[PDB]
Coordinates of C-alpha atoms and ligand atoms in Angstrom, one line a residue:
Chain A
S2 CA -22.2 2.8 33.4
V3 CA -20.4 5.6 35.2
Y4 CA -17.6 8.1 34.0
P5 CA -13.5 6.4 33.8
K6 CA -11.9 8.0 37.9
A7 CA -9.1 9.3 35.8
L8 CA -11.6 11.2 33.9
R9 CA -13.4 11.7 37.5
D10 CA -10.0 13.3 38.7
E11 CA -9.9 15.8 36.9
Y12 CA -12.5 17.0 35.8
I13 CA -16.5 17.9 37.0
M14 CA -18.7 17.2 34.7
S15 CA -21.9 18.4 33.6
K16 CA -25.1 18.8 30.8
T17 CA -24.8 17.4 27.4
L18 CA -24.1 20.5 24.2
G19 CA -24.7 17.7 21.1
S20 CA -25.2 14.4 20.2
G21 CA -23.5 12.8 17.1
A22 CA -24.4 8.8 16.6
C23 CA -21.0 7.9 17.8
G24 CA -21.8 9.0 21.0
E25 CA -22.2 12.7 22.5
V26 CA -20.4 16.4 23.8
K27 CA -19.8 17.3 27.4
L28 CA -20.1 20.4 29.0
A29 CA -16.9 20.0 31.8
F30 CA -14.8 21.6 34.4
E31 CA -11.1 21.6 34.3
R32 CA -11.1 21.1 38.1
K33 CA -6.5 22.9 38.3
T34 CA -8.0 26.1 35.5
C35 CA -12.4 26.0 36.9
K36 CA -12.4 26.7 32.3
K37 CA -14.7 25.2 30.3
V38 CA -13.5 22.5 28.8
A39 CA -15.8 20.5 25.7
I40 CA -15.2 16.6 25.9
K41 CA -16.6 14.6 22.7
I42 CA -17.6 10.7 24.0
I43 CA -17.6 7.6 21.0
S44 CA -18.1 4.5 22.3
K45 CA -16.9 1.5 22.0
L60 CA -9.7 3.8 11.2
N61 CA -9.1 3.8 14.8
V62 CA -9.9 6.6 17.7
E63 CA -6.3 6.9 19.1
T64 CA -5.0 7.0 15.3
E65 CA -7.1 9.9 15.0
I66 CA -6.6 11.5 18.2
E67 CA -2.2 11.3 16.8
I68 CA -2.8 13.4 13.9
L69 CA -4.2 15.7 15.9
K70 CA -2.0 16.0 18.2
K71 CA 0.5 16.6 15.4
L72 CA -1.1 19.0 13.4
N73 CA -1.2 23.1 14.4
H74 CA -3.4 24.9 12.6
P75 CA -6.0 27.2 14.4
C76 CA -8.7 26.2 11.9
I77 CA -7.9 22.7 13.0
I78 CA -9.9 21.7 16.8
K79 CA -7.0 20.5 20.1
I80 CA -6.7 18.0 22.0
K81 CA -6.5 18.4 25.3
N82 CA -6.3 14.9 26.9
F83 CA -7.1 11.4 26.4
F84 CA -9.4 9.3 28.1
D85 CA -8.9 5.7 26.9
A86 CA -12.0 3.0 29.2
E87 CA -14.5 1.9 28.3
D88 CA -15.7 4.3 26.3
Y89 CA -13.3 6.8 24.3
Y90 CA -13.5 10.8 25.8
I91 CA -11.8 13.6 24.1
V92 CA -11.2 16.9 26.2
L93 CA -11.3 20.0 23.8
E94 CA -11.8 23.8 23.9
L95 CA -15.0 24.4 23.8
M96 CA -16.5 26.1 20.5
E97 CA -19.5 28.1 22.0
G98 CA -20.9 28.5 18.1
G99 CA -21.3 24.4 18.2
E100 CA -21.7 23.2 14.5
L101 CA -22.4 24.7 11.4
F102 CA -24.6 22.6 10.1
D103 CA -27.3 24.8 12.9
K104 CA -26.9 27.6 10.4
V105 CA -27.2 26.3 7.2
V106 CA -30.1 23.1 8.4
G107 CA -33.9 24.0 7.1
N108 CA -33.1 26.6 4.4
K109 CA -31.5 29.8 6.8
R110 CA -28.2 30.6 4.7
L111 CA -25.7 33.4 6.0
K112 CA -24.8 36.9 4.2
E113 CA -22.4 36.4 1.3
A114 CA -19.5 38.1 3.9
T115 CA -20.0 35.1 7.1
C116 CA -19.8 33.0 4.1
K117 CA -16.2 33.9 2.7
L118 CA -15.0 34.6 6.5
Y119 CA -15.9 31.2 7.4
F120 CA -15.3 29.5 3.7
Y121 CA -11.6 31.1 3.6
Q122 CA -10.5 30.0 7.3
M123 CA -11.9 26.0 5.6
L124 CA -9.8 26.2 2.7
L125 CA -6.0 27.7 5.2
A126 CA -7.5 24.3 7.4
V127 CA -7.3 21.6 4.7
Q128 CA -4.0 23.3 2.9
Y129 CA -2.5 22.9 5.7
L130 CA -3.6 19.5 6.1
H131 CA -2.6 18.5 2.3
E132 CA 0.9 20.6 3.0
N133 CA 1.2 18.3 5.9
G134 CA 0.0 14.8 3.8
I135 CA -3.2 14.3 5.5
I136 CA -6.9 14.3 3.8
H137 CA -9.9 14.7 5.7
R138 CA -13.0 12.5 3.5
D139 CA -15.5 13.5 5.9
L140 CA -16.2 17.8 4.9
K141 CA -19.5 18.7 6.3
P142 CA -20.8 21.4 8.1
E143 CA -21.2 19.0 11.3
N144 CA -17.3 18.7 10.9
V145 CA -16.9 22.3 11.2
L146 CA -17.2 23.9 14.4
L147 CA -18.1 28.2 15.2
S148 CA -16.2 29.9 18.5
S149 CA -18.8 31.7 19.6
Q150 CA -21.9 33.1 19.2
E151 CA -21.5 35.8 17.0
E152 CA -21.6 36.2 13.3
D153 CA -18.0 36.6 13.1
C154 CA -16.0 34.2 14.7
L155 CA -13.2 31.3 13.8
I156 CA -14.1 28.2 12.8
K157 CA -12.8 24.6 13.7
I158 CA -12.3 21.6 11.8
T159 CA -13.1 17.9 13.3
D160 CA -13.5 14.9 12.9
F161 CA -10.6 12.8 11.6
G162 CA -12.3 9.7 12.0
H163 CA -12.0 9.3 7.9
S164 CA -9.7 10.9 7.6
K165 CA -5.9 9.3 6.0
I166 CA -2.4 10.0 6.4
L167 CA -0.9 10.1 2.9
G168 CA 3.1 9.1 2.3
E169 CA 4.7 6.2 -0.3
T170 CA 2.2 4.0 -1.8
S171 CA 1.5 0.4 -3.2
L172 CA 2.5 2.7 -6.9
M173 CA 6.2 4.1 -6.4
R174 CA 7.4 1.5 -4.5
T175 CA 6.2 -1.7 -7.7
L176 CA 7.7 2.1 -10.6
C177 CA 10.9 1.3 -9.3
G178 CA 10.5 -0.8 -12.3
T179 CA 10.1 -3.8 -14.3
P180 CA 6.3 -4.1 -14.8
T181 CA 7.5 -7.4 -16.5
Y182 CA 4.7 -9.4 -14.4
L183 CA 2.4 -5.8 -13.7
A184 CA -1.0 -6.2 -14.6
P185 CA -2.7 -3.1 -17.4
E186 CA -5.1 -1.9 -14.9
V187 CA -2.0 -0.7 -12.1
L188 CA -0.4 0.5 -15.4
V189 CA -3.4 2.7 -16.9
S190 CA -3.5 4.3 -12.9
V191 CA -0.7 5.7 -12.9
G192 CA -2.7 8.6 -14.7
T193 CA -4.7 9.1 -11.9
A194 CA -3.0 8.3 -9.0
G195 CA -1.7 11.2 -6.3
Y196 CA -4.5 13.6 -6.6
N197 CA -7.3 11.8 -3.6
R198 CA -7.1 15.0 -1.7
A199 CA -9.1 16.7 -4.7
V200 CA -12.3 15.2 -2.1
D201 CA -11.6 17.7 0.2
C202 CA -12.0 20.8 -2.5
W203 CA -15.4 19.2 -3.8
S204 CA -16.8 18.5 0.0
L205 CA -15.7 21.8 0.3
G206 CA -17.8 23.5 -2.8
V207 CA -21.2 21.6 -1.9
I208 CA -20.5 23.4 1.4
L209 CA -20.4 26.5 0.2
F210 CA -22.5 26.0 -2.4
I211 CA -24.7 25.5 0.8
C212 CA -24.2 27.8 2.8
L213 CA -24.8 30.4 0.5
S214 CA -27.6 29.2 -1.0
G215 CA -29.0 27.0 1.6
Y216 CA -30.4 24.0 0.3
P217 CA -27.8 20.9 -0.8
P218 CA -26.7 21.1 -5.2
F219 CA -27.5 16.9 -5.5
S220 CA -30.0 15.6 -3.3
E221 CA -33.5 13.6 -3.8
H222 CA -35.5 16.0 -3.5
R223 CA -38.7 16.4 -6.3
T224 CA -36.5 14.7 -8.8
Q225 CA -36.3 11.7 -11.4
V226 CA -32.4 11.7 -11.2
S227 CA -30.4 9.8 -9.0
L228 CA -28.6 11.0 -6.4
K229 CA -25.6 9.5 -8.2
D230 CA -26.0 10.6 -11.8
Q231 CA -26.3 14.7 -10.3
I232 CA -23.1 14.0 -9.0
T233 CA -21.3 12.2 -11.7
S234 CA -22.6 14.1 -14.3
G235 CA -21.9 17.2 -12.2
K236 CA -25.4 18.9 -12.7
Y237 CA -26.4 20.4 -8.9
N238 CA -30.8 22.1 -8.8
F239 CA -29.2 25.5 -9.7
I240 CA -32.3 27.3 -8.5
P241 CA -32.5 31.7 -9.6
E242 CA -34.5 33.1 -7.2
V243 CA -32.5 31.8 -4.4
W244 CA -29.3 32.7 -5.7
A245 CA -29.9 35.7 -7.0
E246 CA -28.7 37.8 -3.9
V247 CA -25.8 36.6 -4.0
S248 CA -22.3 37.9 -5.9
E249 CA -20.8 36.1 -9.5
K250 CA -17.4 35.9 -8.4
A251 CA -19.2 33.7 -5.1
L252 CA -20.8 31.5 -8.2
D253 CA -17.6 30.9 -10.0
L254 CA -15.5 29.5 -7.5
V255 CA -18.7 27.6 -6.2
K256 CA -18.0 26.3 -9.4
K257 CA -15.0 25.3 -10.0
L258 CA -15.0 22.9 -6.7
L259 CA -17.4 21.1 -8.5
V260 CA -15.4 19.8 -10.7
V261 CA -16.0 16.6 -11.8
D262 CA -13.3 16.0 -13.2
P263 CA -10.4 15.4 -9.6
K264 CA -7.0 17.4 -11.7
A265 CA -8.7 19.6 -13.3
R266 CA -10.2 21.0 -9.7
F267 CA -9.2 23.8 -7.6
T268 CA -7.4 22.8 -5.7
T269 CA -7.3 24.9 -2.0
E270 CA -4.2 26.5 -3.9
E271 CA -6.2 27.9 -6.2
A272 CA -9.7 28.8 -4.4
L273 CA -7.3 31.4 -1.6
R274 CA -6.5 33.5 -4.8
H275 CA -9.4 32.7 -6.6
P276 CA -10.7 36.3 -6.7
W277 CA -14.3 36.1 -4.5
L278 CA -11.3 35.1 -1.6
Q279 CA -9.3 38.9 -2.1
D280 CA -11.1 40.2 0.6
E281 CA -8.8 42.8 2.8
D282 CA -11.8 43.6 5.4
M283 CA -12.7 40.0 5.7
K284 CA -9.3 38.9 5.9
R285 CA -8.0 41.7 7.9
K286 CA -11.2 40.6 10.1
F287 CA -9.7 37.3 10.4
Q288 CA -6.4 38.4 11.5
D289 CA -8.2 40.4 14.3
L290 CA -10.1 37.5 15.5
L291 CA -7.0 36.0 15.8
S292 CA -5.5 37.8 18.3
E293 CA -8.0 38.7 20.0
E294 CA -8.0 34.3 21.0
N295 CA -5.1 35.4 23.6
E296 CA -2.8 35.2 26.0
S297 CA 0.4 35.7 25.1
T298 CA 4.2 35.6 27.3
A299 CA 5.3 38.7 27.0
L300 CA 8.7 38.7 24.0
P301 CA 12.1 40.7 23.8
Chain B
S2 CA 28.8 -8.1 11.5
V3 CA 28.4 -12.1 13.1
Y4 CA 25.3 -14.1 13.2
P5 CA 22.6 -13.2 16.3
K6 CA 23.5 -14.7 19.1
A7 CA 19.4 -16.7 19.5
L8 CA 19.5 -17.8 16.1
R9 CA 24.4 -19.8 16.3
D10 CA 22.1 -21.1 19.9
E11 CA 19.4 -23.2 17.7
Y12 CA 21.0 -24.0 14.2
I13 CA 24.4 -24.4 12.7
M14 CA 25.0 -21.6 9.5
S15 CA 27.0 -23.4 6.6
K16 CA 26.9 -22.4 2.8
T17 CA 25.1 -19.5 0.5
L18 CA 22.4 -21.4 -1.5
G19 CA 20.8 -17.6 -3.0
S20 CA 20.7 -14.3 -3.2
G21 CA 18.1 -12.1 -3.4
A22 CA 18.1 -7.6 -3.3
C23 CA 16.9 -8.1 -0.2
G24 CA 19.5 -10.7 0.7
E25 CA 21.3 -14.1 0.3
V26 CA 19.3 -17.6 1.2
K27 CA 21.9 -19.3 3.9
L28 CA 22.4 -23.6 4.6
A29 CA 22.3 -24.5 7.8
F30 CA 21.5 -27.3 10.4
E31 CA 19.1 -27.0 13.2
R32 CA 21.1 -28.4 16.0
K33 CA 18.3 -30.2 18.4
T34 CA 17.7 -33.0 14.6
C35 CA 21.0 -32.3 12.8
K36 CA 18.6 -32.0 9.6
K37 CA 19.1 -28.8 6.7
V38 CA 16.5 -26.1 6.6
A39 CA 17.2 -22.3 5.0
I40 CA 17.5 -19.2 6.7
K41 CA 16.1 -15.5 4.4
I42 CA 18.4 -13.0 5.5
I43 CA 16.9 -9.6 5.0
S44 CA 18.6 -6.5 5.5
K45 CA 17.2 -3.9 8.3
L60 CA 5.2 -3.7 4.2
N61 CA 7.3 -5.1 7.0
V62 CA 9.1 -8.4 7.6
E63 CA 7.2 -9.2 10.9
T64 CA 3.5 -8.6 9.6
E65 CA 4.4 -11.1 6.8
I66 CA 5.1 -13.6 8.9
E67 CA 2.3 -13.2 10.1
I68 CA 0.3 -13.6 7.2
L69 CA 2.8 -17.3 6.1
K70 CA 2.1 -18.3 10.3
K71 CA -1.2 -17.9 9.9
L72 CA -1.4 -20.5 6.3
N73 CA -1.5 -23.3 5.8
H74 CA -1.6 -24.5 2.5
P75 CA 1.1 -27.7 0.7
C76 CA 2.2 -25.4 -1.9
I77 CA 2.6 -22.1 0.3
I78 CA 6.1 -21.4 2.2
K79 CA 5.9 -22.7 6.0
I80 CA 8.2 -20.2 8.8
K81 CA 9.8 -22.5 11.0
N82 CA 11.7 -19.2 13.1
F83 CA 12.5 -16.4 13.3
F84 CA 14.8 -13.7 14.6
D85 CA 14.7 -10.3 14.7
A86 CA 17.7 -8.8 15.0
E87 CA 20.2 -6.6 13.2
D88 CA 18.9 -8.5 10.0
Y89 CA 16.5 -10.3 9.4
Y90 CA 16.3 -14.0 10.1
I91 CA 13.3 -16.5 8.7
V92 CA 14.1 -20.4 8.5
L93 CA 11.9 -22.6 6.3
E94 CA 12.6 -25.4 5.1
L95 CA 15.0 -27.0 2.6
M96 CA 14.0 -26.4 -1.2
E97 CA 16.4 -28.2 -2.8
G98 CA 15.3 -27.6 -6.5
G99 CA 16.1 -23.9 -6.2
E100 CA 13.6 -21.2 -8.0
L101 CA 11.8 -22.0 -10.5
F102 CA 13.2 -18.9 -12.5
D103 CA 16.4 -21.4 -12.9
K104 CA 14.3 -23.7 -14.8
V105 CA 13.1 -21.0 -17.4
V106 CA 16.5 -18.2 -18.1
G107 CA 18.1 -18.1 -20.9
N108 CA 15.3 -19.6 -23.0
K109 CA 15.1 -22.8 -21.7
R110 CA 11.5 -24.1 -21.1
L111 CA 10.0 -27.7 -19.4
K112 CA 7.7 -29.9 -21.5
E113 CA 4.1 -29.0 -21.1
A114 CA 3.6 -31.9 -18.2
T115 CA 5.7 -30.4 -15.2
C116 CA 4.7 -26.5 -16.9
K117 CA 0.7 -27.9 -16.3
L118 CA 2.0 -29.7 -12.9
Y119 CA 4.1 -26.7 -11.7
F120 CA 1.3 -24.7 -12.8
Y121 CA -1.8 -26.6 -11.2
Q122 CA -0.2 -25.9 -7.7
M123 CA 0.1 -22.2 -9.0
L124 CA -3.5 -21.9 -9.0
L125 CA -4.2 -24.4 -6.2
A126 CA -1.6 -21.5 -4.1
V127 CA -2.7 -18.7 -5.3
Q128 CA -7.2 -19.5 -5.3
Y129 CA -6.9 -20.6 -1.1
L130 CA -5.1 -17.0 -0.8
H131 CA -7.9 -15.5 -2.6
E132 CA -10.1 -17.2 -0.8
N133 CA -8.5 -16.5 2.4
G134 CA -8.1 -12.9 2.0
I135 CA -5.0 -12.5 0.9
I136 CA -3.9 -10.9 -2.8
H137 CA 1.1 -12.2 -3.1
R138 CA 1.4 -8.8 -5.5
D139 CA 4.4 -10.6 -6.5
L140 CA 3.8 -13.7 -8.4
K141 CA 7.6 -14.8 -10.9
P142 CA 9.5 -17.7 -11.4
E143 CA 11.8 -16.2 -8.5
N144 CA 8.9 -16.1 -6.3
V145 CA 7.9 -20.3 -6.7
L146 CA 10.2 -23.1 -4.8
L147 CA 10.8 -26.7 -5.9
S148 CA 10.8 -29.4 -3.6
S149 CA 13.4 -31.9 -4.6
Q150 CA 15.5 -31.7 -8.7
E151 CA 13.1 -33.4 -9.7
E152 CA 11.4 -32.4 -12.3
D153 CA 8.0 -33.8 -10.9
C154 CA 8.5 -32.2 -8.1
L155 CA 5.5 -30.4 -5.3
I156 CA 6.3 -25.3 -5.7
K157 CA 6.1 -23.7 -2.9
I158 CA 5.3 -20.3 -3.3
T159 CA 7.4 -17.3 -1.4
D160 CA 7.8 -13.6 -0.4
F161 CA 4.7 -12.4 1.3
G162 CA 7.1 -8.6 1.2
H163 CA 3.9 -7.2 -1.1
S164 CA 1.3 -8.7 0.1
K165 CA -1.6 -6.9 1.4
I166 CA -4.7 -8.5 3.3
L167 CA -8.3 -7.8 2.0
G168 CA -10.8 -6.1 4.3
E169 CA -14.1 -3.9 4.8
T170 CA -12.8 -1.0 2.7
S171 CA -13.0 2.9 2.8
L172 CA -15.5 2.8 0.0
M173 CA -18.2 0.1 2.2
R174 CA -17.3 3.1 4.9
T175 CA -18.6 5.3 2.7
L176 CA -21.0 4.0 0.3
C177 CA -23.2 3.6 4.1
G178 CA -25.3 5.7 2.8
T179 CA -25.6 9.4 2.0
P180 CA -23.5 10.6 -0.4
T181 CA -24.1 14.3 -0.7
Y182 CA -21.2 15.6 0.4
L183 CA -18.8 12.0 -1.2
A184 CA -16.7 13.7 -4.5
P185 CA -17.9 11.8 -8.1
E186 CA -14.5 10.0 -8.9
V187 CA -14.9 7.7 -5.8
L188 CA -19.6 7.0 -7.0
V189 CA -17.1 6.5 -10.4
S190 CA -15.2 3.7 -8.5
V191 CA -17.5 1.5 -8.2
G192 CA -17.7 0.5 -11.6
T193 CA -13.8 -1.3 -10.6
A194 CA -13.6 -2.1 -6.8
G195 CA -13.0 -5.1 -5.6
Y196 CA -10.6 -6.7 -7.7
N197 CA -7.1 -6.7 -7.1
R198 CA -7.0 -10.0 -6.4
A199 CA -7.1 -10.1 -10.4
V200 CA -3.2 -8.8 -10.3
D201 CA -2.1 -12.3 -9.8
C202 CA -4.1 -13.5 -12.0
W203 CA -2.0 -11.6 -15.0
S204 CA 0.8 -12.7 -12.8
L205 CA 0.6 -16.5 -13.0
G206 CA -0.8 -15.9 -17.3
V207 CA 2.3 -14.2 -17.6
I208 CA 4.5 -16.9 -15.6
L209 CA 2.1 -19.3 -17.4
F210 CA 3.2 -17.8 -20.8
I211 CA 6.6 -18.1 -20.0
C212 CA 7.2 -21.4 -18.4
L213 CA 5.3 -23.1 -22.1
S214 CA 7.7 -21.1 -24.2
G215 CA 10.4 -19.9 -22.2
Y216 CA 10.5 -16.3 -22.9
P217 CA 8.4 -13.3 -21.9
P218 CA 5.3 -12.1 -23.2
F219 CA 5.9 -8.3 -23.1
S220 CA 9.4 -7.4 -23.5
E221 CA 11.7 -4.7 -24.5
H222 CA 13.4 -7.2 -27.0
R223 CA 14.2 -6.5 -30.5
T224 CA 10.5 -3.6 -31.1
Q225 CA 9.9 -0.4 -30.8
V226 CA 6.4 -0.7 -28.9
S227 CA 6.7 0.3 -25.1
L228 CA 6.6 -2.5 -22.6
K229 CA 3.8 0.1 -21.3
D230 CA 2.0 0.1 -24.5
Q231 CA 2.5 -4.1 -24.8
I232 CA 0.7 -4.8 -21.6
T233 CA -2.0 -2.0 -21.8
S234 CA -3.1 -3.4 -25.1
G235 CA -2.6 -6.4 -24.5
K236 CA -0.7 -7.0 -27.2
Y237 CA 2.0 -10.6 -26.6
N238 CA 4.4 -11.3 -28.3
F239 CA 4.0 -14.2 -30.5
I240 CA 6.2 -16.2 -32.1
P241 CA 5.2 -19.8 -33.9
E242 CA 7.3 -21.3 -34.0
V243 CA 8.7 -21.1 -30.0
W244 CA 4.7 -22.3 -29.9
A245 CA 4.0 -25.2 -32.4
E246 CA 4.9 -27.6 -30.1
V247 CA 2.2 -26.7 -27.5
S248 CA -0.7 -27.7 -27.4
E249 CA -4.4 -25.0 -28.6
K250 CA -5.5 -25.9 -24.3
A251 CA -2.5 -24.8 -23.0
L252 CA -2.7 -21.7 -25.2
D253 CA -6.2 -20.7 -24.9
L254 CA -5.8 -20.8 -21.0
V255 CA -2.9 -17.8 -21.6
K256 CA -5.4 -16.0 -23.6
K257 CA -7.9 -15.9 -21.0
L258 CA -5.1 -14.8 -18.4
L259 CA -3.9 -12.2 -20.4
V260 CA -7.1 -10.9 -20.5
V261 CA -6.8 -6.7 -19.5
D262 CA -10.1 -6.1 -18.3
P263 CA -10.1 -7.8 -14.7
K264 CA -13.7 -8.0 -14.7
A265 CA -13.3 -10.0 -17.8
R266 CA -10.3 -11.6 -16.9
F267 CA -10.0 -15.7 -16.1
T268 CA -10.2 -15.8 -11.3
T269 CA -8.2 -18.8 -10.0
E270 CA -10.8 -20.9 -10.2
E271 CA -11.9 -20.2 -13.8
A272 CA -9.3 -21.4 -15.0
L273 CA -8.9 -25.0 -12.9
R274 CA -11.4 -25.6 -14.8
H275 CA -10.3 -25.6 -17.6
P276 CA -9.8 -28.0 -19.9
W277 CA -6.1 -28.1 -19.9
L278 CA -5.9 -28.5 -16.1
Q279 CA -8.9 -31.5 -16.3
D280 CA -5.5 -34.3 -16.6
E281 CA -6.4 -37.1 -13.8
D282 CA -2.6 -37.8 -15.2
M283 CA -1.3 -34.9 -14.1
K284 CA -3.9 -34.6 -10.8
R285 CA -2.6 -38.7 -9.8
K286 CA 1.0 -37.3 -10.2
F287 CA 0.2 -34.4 -7.0
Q288 CA -1.3 -36.8 -4.8
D289 CA 1.4 -38.8 -4.8
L290 CA 3.2 -36.1 -4.0
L291 CA 2.3 -35.1 -1.1
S292 CA 1.5 -38.5 0.8
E293 CA 5.4 -38.6 -0.5
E294 CA 5.9 -35.6 2.2
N295 CA 5.1 -37.9 4.6
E296 CA 5.6 -38.4 8.1
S297 CA 2.2 -38.3 9.7
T298 CA 1.0 -39.7 12.4
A299 CA -0.8 -43.1 13.3
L300 CA -5.3 -42.8 12.8
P301 CA -7.5 -44.5 14.2
Ligands
YIR1 N1 -16.1 10.5 15.9 C1 -15.0 10.8 15.5 N2 -14.2 9.4 15.2 N3 -14.1 12.2 16.3 N4 -15.0 12.5 16.5 C2 -14.3 13.9 16.8 C3 -12.6 14.5 17.2 C4 -12.4 15.2 17.4 C5 -12.9 15.5 18.9 C6 -15.0 16.1 18.1 C7 -15.5 17.1 19.1 C8 -16.7 17.5 18.6 N5 -17.2 18.1 18.7 C9 -17.6 19.0 19.6 O1 -15.8 18.7 20.1 C10 -18.5 19.5 19.7 C11 -20.1 19.8 18.6 C12 -20.2 20.9 20.1 C13 -21.8 21.4 19.4 C14 -22.7 22.3 20.2 C15 -21.6 23.0 21.0 C16 -20.4 22.8 21.5 N6 -19.5 23.4 22.2 O2 -19.4 24.4 23.0 O3 -18.1 23.3 22.2 C17 -19.5 21.8 20.9 N7 -18.8 20.7 20.3 C18 -16.9 16.5 17.2 C19 -16.6 15.0 17.0 C20 -14.9 15.4 17.4
YIR2 N1 11.6 -10.6 0.7 C1 10.1 -10.6 1.6 N2 10.5 -10.3 2.5 N3 10.2 -11.7 2.1 N4 10.9 -13.6 1.5 C2 10.7 -14.3 1.7 C3 9.3 -14.4 3.0 C4 9.7 -16.2 3.6 C5 10.9 -16.9 3.4 C6 11.6 -16.4 1.5 C7 12.1 -17.2 1.3 C8 13.0 -17.4 0.6 N5 13.9 -18.4 -0.7 C9 14.7 -19.6 0.1 O1 13.2 -19.9 1.1 C10 15.6 -20.5 -1.3 C11 15.7 -20.1 -2.3 C12 16.4 -20.7 -2.9 C13 17.7 -21.0 -3.3 C14 18.8 -23.1 -4.4 C15 18.6 -23.3 -3.3 C16 17.1 -23.1 -2.2 N6 16.8 -24.4 -1.1 O2 17.2 -25.3 -0.7 O3 15.6 -23.8 -0.5 C17 16.5 -21.9 -1.8 N7 15.4 -21.4 -0.9 C18 13.1 -15.8 -0.4 C19 11.6 -15.0 -0.1 C20 11.5 -15.6 1.4

């Protein structure tokens, strides 16, 4: 099949930049400006509502939608993230220097904090869903793929608790203890991402062990290899450990992580602000 | 304000039959047939989707929608249930004879079984949401008010479990043990309803006790008053006890309740079938 007419009208399509299970990412040129864009193809919960979420969000570490076409397949137009996926930087036991880990992780934290402040949980944070702005090591990152995201709001539980529980089942009452911590799943995922970035290997995996992946995760017993970690700081590992806390209520939130000693780094923060300014292009100001 | 024009066009509105928090139930006459109908008014999750659920359901113990008007308020037209709410038969310590309890409860079980077979959970079963067809003690009952209902389907959990949990939080894995038993909340509610019908008083309540309502429910320790129950059979109480089981996985399902010795009653079942046939009105058959 061909590209939809409406897409062809505005864009010239070019080479493949990447592939997901859902579909490819293509290079394209916007006809009006002659500038490069990326087009994510998703073949035919749903995409239109994901796009609606992303249209409302406004944060420099969250991907922005330039255009959208709902045709035979879905075509999503966004700015080019020439660095590609974080995945490719950590695969095959490759690892980033601690400084680069901190810069990237600070931005992930700011992004996820913004999401949680805005009543959104991502629920699919992993290195394949972190995009890099450039091939330079010091670059902005942007979180993508909101296909598993969920919008927080007034729960069925809250409506039930406007009393009285004469006919209400005990398990609903018991669920009150732990309700409203769904966002903590993103903080766990961030912990796994950080672990992988610092060490070059996954904390929980079926590689050379008889402990099931499930038991590894529920017990919180990550695979600690001293020689790999000797090079990494104690402060970096300390943060990892406060994010990979099994009790979701005790787990570090994004606010707690941002206040952690590891992220109290004015150099890293200077670099991030420098990177933000480079990205413009602003209008004149009074 | 006035009734909507489209409603007035088809119906003549009459006296008030009842009141909810949401709004009244009115007597009306359908102009075409000159026959009596009930009109439920709900003032402006949502009603249109509730109406959509109820339009698809087809069971003699579940209320049917005749018409619907979405105007300043919502107007829902249904058959008249002249017996009114079950609530009025059990209030002020009044109680039904065991035989009448069995007939009504059998029908509630059939209704809720049908719901669960069809992927629907009611979540608001109580005596105010059970309607009686006539003022005769032996009558058909119909469950109403689907405003808290929920449609079962592929969960976020099921999509997550299509592996692999490298980045997945332990609490999600732990939730697997108890997932897919949301329907059991209806069985608990039925247990409370049955308790109230047989005894004339609620199993869990703040009346003359220092045990909090919440602690009463979560511990499963219902208020047992021997003198009130002496008249009721052991088989009736046995079923009550298998429905008011605190562990939702161990709780009786509607199928288990229907197979309970208390409901193995050919007289009651004869009466129900007789009542179904009276309700028609069928076309000629080959
Ligand atoms: N699945 C879903 N429901 N939503 N998904 C989404 C929703 C928003 C758009 C979106 C974009 C991406 N990915 C890219 O843009 C991208 C990958 C890549 C690799 C190399 C170079 C470049 N590049 O030089 O630009 C690249 N850009 C992956 C997933 C999704
Ligand atoms: N709240 C909501 N979201 N949906 N509610 C609903 C949705 C479906 C319609 C509906 C009907 C009723 N109730 C009646 O019909 C009714 C009460 C009554 C009392 C005395 C006599 C008669 N009668 O002689 O008929 C009566 N009919 C209560 C709630 C709801």
